[PDB]
C-alpha cells in the first residue's frame, strides 16, 4: 500500500489508453477520473485506465 489493489475480474483493453488486466493481478492505483468510473493504474504489463469497480484494495 497504501495504493495497492487487486483485480476482481478480467478486463480486456478497449483502446483509448485502457489497460488489460487479469483477475488476481496486482495494481498500483494512480487515481480516478472525474466521475470515478475509471481508474488509472500501473501493473507489470504497463499503465492505463481500468474500470474502478473491477478492482479492490489489498494488503
Amino acid at each position: 500500500d497504501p495504493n495497492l489493489f487487486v483485480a476482481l475480474y478480467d478486463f480486456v483493453a478497449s483502446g483509448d489508453n485502457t489497460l488489460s488486466i487479469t483477475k488476481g493481478e496486482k495494481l498500483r492505483v494512480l487515481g480516478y477520473n472525474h466521475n470515478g468510473e475509471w481508474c488509472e493504474a500501473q501493473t507489470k504489463n504497463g499503465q492505463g485506465w481500468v474500470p474502478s469497480n473491477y478492482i479492490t484494495p489489498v494488503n
Binding site: 485502457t18 468510473e37 475509471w38 485506465w49 474500470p51 469497480n53
Partner: peptide, 10 residues
C-alpha cells in the same frame, strides 16, 4: 480516461 463508461461488473 475514456469518455464512454466502462463495462459493468462482473
Amino acid at each position: 480516461a475514456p469518455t464512454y463508461p466502462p463495462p459493468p461488473p462482473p
